Write a structure and sequence with these properties.
The structure is cut from a larger assembly and holds chains A (132 residues), B (61 residues), C (189 residues) and D (56 residues).
Chain A lengths: L5 H13 L8 H11 E2 L6 H16 L11 H9 L13 E3 L1 H9 L8 E3 L14
Parallel strand pairs in A: 2-3
Helix pairs in contact in A: 1-3, 2-3
Chain B lengths: L2 E12 L5 E8 L7 E6 L9 E2 L10
Antiparallel strand pairs in B: 1-2, 1-4, 2-3
Chain D lengths: L1 E4 L4 E4 L24 E2 L17
Antiparallel strand pairs in D: 1-2
The chains are: A mainly alpha (132), B mainly beta (61), C mainly alpha (189), D mainly beta (56).
Chain C binds one RNA strand of 313 nucleotides through helix 1, helix 2, strand 2 and helix 4.
Chain lengths: 132, 61, 189, 56
Amino acid sequence: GRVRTKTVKKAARVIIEKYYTRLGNDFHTNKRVCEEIAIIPSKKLRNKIAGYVTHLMKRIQRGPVRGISIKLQEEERERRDNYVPEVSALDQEIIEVDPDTKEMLKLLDFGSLSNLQVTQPTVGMNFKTPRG
Amino acid sequence: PIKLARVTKVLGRTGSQGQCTQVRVEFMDDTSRSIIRNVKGPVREGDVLTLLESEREARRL
Amino acid sequence: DIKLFGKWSTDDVQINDISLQDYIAVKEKYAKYLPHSAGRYAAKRFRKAQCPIVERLTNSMMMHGRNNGKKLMTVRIVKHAFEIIHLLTGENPLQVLVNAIINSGPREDSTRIGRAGTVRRQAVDVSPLRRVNQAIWLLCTGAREAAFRNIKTIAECLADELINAAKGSSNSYAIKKKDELERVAKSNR
Amino acid sequence: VRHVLLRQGVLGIKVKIMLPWDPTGKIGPKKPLPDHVSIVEPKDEILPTTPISEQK
RNA sequence: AACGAGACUCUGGCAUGCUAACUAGUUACGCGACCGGUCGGCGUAACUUCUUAGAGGGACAAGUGGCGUUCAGCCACCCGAGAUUGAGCAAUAACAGGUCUGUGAUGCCCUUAGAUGUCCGGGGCUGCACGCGCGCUACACUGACUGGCUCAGCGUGUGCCUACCCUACGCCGGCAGGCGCGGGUAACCCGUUGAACCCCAUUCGUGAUGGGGAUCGGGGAUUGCAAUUAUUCCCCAUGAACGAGGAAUUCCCAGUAAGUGCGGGUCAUAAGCUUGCGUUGAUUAAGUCCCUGCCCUUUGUACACACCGCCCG
C-alpha cells in the first residue's frame, strides 16, 4: 500500500510548521515551494513531501492537528482562552442549598446569608446502583 | 422448482481453501426472503444467481 | 454497421437467461470486426466480462501445448466454424453461440473437503461468471477431444458441438459434463 | 580488506569507514544522503502594519 | 536515538517541447528508369516526426465519491503515457554448509631425484546387467511435406605472450565445401542484420502411415600435429520404441505461461547446456490457512553437545 514513512512525515511536519503562509491546496505550487524551501534529494521524495503537505494543509482548515503548532490557530486559541463573560456564572441571586448545608454554614456562622434558598430534601434514600 | 435470484451484499469468503464466497441473496419475485448461500466462483454485488433448491442454508465447510 | 468477419451482424442476437445478460458480451457496443483485439482484459478482476465472447472462444481454442501462441490459427478456425454452423442450421451463427454458452455451464458444483485420500464433498451454487468460464471450457475441450485422431477437422468438430450444445443434446461433450457435474452435486446436496 | 601472516596462520582485516558530508574542500562526498532532508530556517516575515508608499 | 525496511542506483513506458546529427534520417526539388503512380535509384536544400543521447519535465494516493474512533489508510472512478514495470544493493546473530582443485592467500604435516616436481609417448576420465536426477525430440489433421509470401531485438567481430574472425561479391560444385577477390579495430563493412514459428497455395488421408526419428552399412568434405572407442558437417539407404503416460512431484499472475527462433560464454573443431534478446501470445486468480512452512502474542514443559529431545519397563 501507500504509507508515508517517518522521513516524509517528519519533513512535511516541519515544513508546514515553518512555512504555512506559502502553502495552499494546489499540489503543484506546493511542490514549487517545497523545492525552494528545502534541499531534498530529488523528485520522487520531493513529490511525496509535497503530497503529504497538500493532504496536511486541507487538514488544518477543519481544525487543529495533534502534531504541529502554527501561529494562526495558536493566536485564535489564545484569544479564545482569554475570554471572560460580562456577568459571571457565580453571580446567582437564588442559590440552592440542602437542609444540611445550611447547618454547616450555621456552624461557620453564615446563617445570616440572604441569597440561600433551601430546597426540599429528597424523600427517598435511593442512590446506590442495583447490584446484580 | 428452480428459482432465480439476486445479490444484496457479499458477506465474506469461507471454505476449506477460501474458494467459496458467502452471499446475502434476495429473490426476484419481489420477495423479502434474504437467504444466505454458498457460491463458488467470482461474485460482486448485484449479480443474478440461479439456484436449484431455494430452501438451503449457509454453513461453513 | 459492424458485422463480425464483415458478414454476420449482431442486432437479432437475443440472450435468453437473465443470469448471463450482464456477463455475456456483444449485442450493442462490443460488436467488433474481428475477434482479435489484443487488449488488457486480465489487468483487473471482472474486467474480462467486458470482452467480446468471440474472443473468449478464440482464446480458449488454443489451449494445448503445441498451439499455445497461435491466435491467427484459431481465429480462422472460428471463422470457418461460423460457415459450417450457418450451413447446418440456416440462421445467424451468433445466436447459437449464446445458446451454447447458456446451456453448457453448470449451476451447482461440489466443493472438495476431506483429508489425504478422504473425499466428502458438499454442494454449493455456481456464480454466473464461472458459468461463462466453464461453458467455453467444456465446449472447447469437446471440440478438441473429438477431433484428435479423426478425419474430421477442428472446424467441423467445433461446429457440430456448438450446435449440439445449443440444442441441448446429450451427444455433445459439453452437456454430458454439465449433467454429471450436477448429478454428483445433487448426490450430496 | 587485507591479510596478515602471523606465526600460527592468517588473519583477515576488514575496515569500513563511513565518510562524512561537507562538500569537498578536501574531504568527504559532495551530496547528502538520500533521506536527509534539510530545511532552510526562515527569517521571519516582518509584520506589515500600515500602508507605506515608499517612492524611491 | 542507531541499523535493516523505505529512500537510493540502473532499466521499461511518455514528450510533433529544448539541445544536434555525411558514421541516422524524413520531406521536397531536379535527373534517370518502367508503366499521375513505383523505386532500399542518384545528387542536392527545409528540418529533426521517425533513429540516436543529453539536460529538464511528468505521478503525488494529487482530483472526485464512498468507508474509516472522519487519524493513519483502504476501495471505486475521471483525467492521464503511466494510478503495484523489472532488477541491483541489503542488518544483528549464526552454520561443525562449500571452497587448501582460482590464487606467487596460507599454518601444520607428507613427499623432494627408480620425486607426490616437471616433461614426453600411449591409454583412461566415454567403459555397462542395473537404480536415481536435470533435459532435448515426440506420440500427429490445431498436422507432416513441397512451393510462395513477409516481419525482429540484444549482441560479437582481425587478439602482449597467441596460433585462433565477422565476412559481402564472382566462379566451380547436388550439397557439406573450394578457389580468388573486396570491406570492417566498426551507428562507416557483414547489415535494411531479407530469422523461425506465423500467413498463403499443392500433396498426403486416421494406418505404427509419408508421424517419429533412434540404431546401423557405404561414400564425400572441412578442423587439427593426430579424428580408429564414430570431433563435427554433407548424401544415399535401414527405419526401433512411442497411441499422451501409475504412485508421486515442479514452475507460474500479464506482454506472464507456453510456443518459436536469434546472439553471448565455452569455441583449432563444436550446444540437446547456460546466459541474455526478440517475435506470436493465452486460460484461470485478485483469495485462504486445509496442506507444506515462516512469523508474532498469550502458555504447558522434569527440553536446553534443545523433539533428530528427555525418558519407562
